[PDB]
């Protein structure tokens, strides 16, 4: 009985990751699985120090000791109330420069760096400043508050499946407006669970008709 410690960020549990983990565990009943909530930012040191074996995150950091495998790039969307005036762009999409003056909900409230610092940098690199930012502690709260009439919110594509009601999701047209999904492992690690879990990634992605970046 091998033990496999998998670090995850909460923002992947509403996407394909649970299904990927389930398939792996079904196919490898000998392996005891420990799922550990671990911020994208903390996974590098966790892996180095042997506290996790696999880090699933939104990692935009390469470390010399770490093999970072980019699985997917997730398009971002602007969640709006369905009768909000930006619903005119439901087909065509919007650029971030068009929405800077919207009451906008940033999430989460957690130790930095995080998805909020990422979303803020997207405006900063584009030379933009949102005038009406409010911090909300989690995406599911942000989305609910958008539905209640509190403004708009930028989310990854997979968040569209979070079942808050009466929303529309406007495609964000900007080239840099995407969030990566990453698998990180130690460079030294040649365990068979790595190719095995990558096979599960490819199979779950194919089930959902999403083309992955990697090629096994």
Q: List interacting residues with its own copies (CB under 8 A).
A: 10, 13-14, 16-19, 21-22, 25-26, 33, 35, 37, 81, 83, 137-138, 140-141, 143-145, 147-150, 161-166
Per CB under 5 A, does 40 bind Cl ion? yes
Partner touching 40 among Cl ion, its own copies, none, CB below 5 to 8 Å by kind: Cl ion
Per CB under 5 A, does 58 bind Cl ion? yes
Q: What are phi and psi of 57, to 5 degrees?
A: -155, -160
Nearer to its own copies, 14 or 205 (CB): 14
Site string for Cl ion, 106-145 (x = CB under 5 A): --------xx------------------------------
Instruction: Compute the half-sphere exposure of residue 27: CA atoms within 13 Å on the CB side of its CA.
Output: 15
- Least Cα distance to 101 among 134, 77, 128, 132 occurs for 132
DSSP letter for 65, please. T
Q: Is 107 exposed, middle or buried (CB count within 10 Å of its CB: 0-12, 13-18, 19+)?
A: buried
Q: How many residues bind Cl ion (CB under 5 A)?
A: 7
């Amino acid at each position: 009985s091998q033990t496999l410690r998998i670090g995850y960020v909460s923002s992947l549990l509403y996407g394909l990751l649970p299904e990927i983990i389930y398939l792996f565990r079904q196919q490898n009943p000998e392996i005891h699985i420990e799922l550990i909530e671990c911020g994208t930012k903390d996974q590098i040191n966790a892996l180095k120090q042997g506290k996790i074996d696999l880090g699933f995150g939104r990692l935009k950091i390469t470390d010399p000791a770490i093999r970072r495998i980019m699985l997917h790039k997730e398009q971002l969307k602007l969640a709006i109330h369905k009768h909000h005036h930006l619903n005119q762009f439901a087909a065509t999409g919007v650029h971030l420069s068009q929405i800077i003056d919207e009451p906008m909900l940033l999430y989460p409230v957690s130790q930095k760096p995080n998805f909020a610092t990422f979303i803020q940098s997207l405006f900063t690199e584009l030379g933009l400043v949102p005038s009406k930012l409010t911090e909300i502690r989690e995406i599911q709260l942000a989305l609910g508050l958008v539905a209640a009439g509190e403004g708009v919110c930028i989310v990854p594509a997979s968040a569209m499946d979070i079942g808050v009601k009466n929303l529309l999701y406007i495609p964000i047209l900007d080239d840099d407006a995407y969030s990566p999904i990453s698998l990180a492992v130690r460079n030294m690690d040649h365990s068979n669970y790595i190719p095995k879990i990558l096979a599960c990634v490819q199979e779950v992605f194919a089930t959902h008709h999403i083309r992955p970046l990697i090629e096994s």
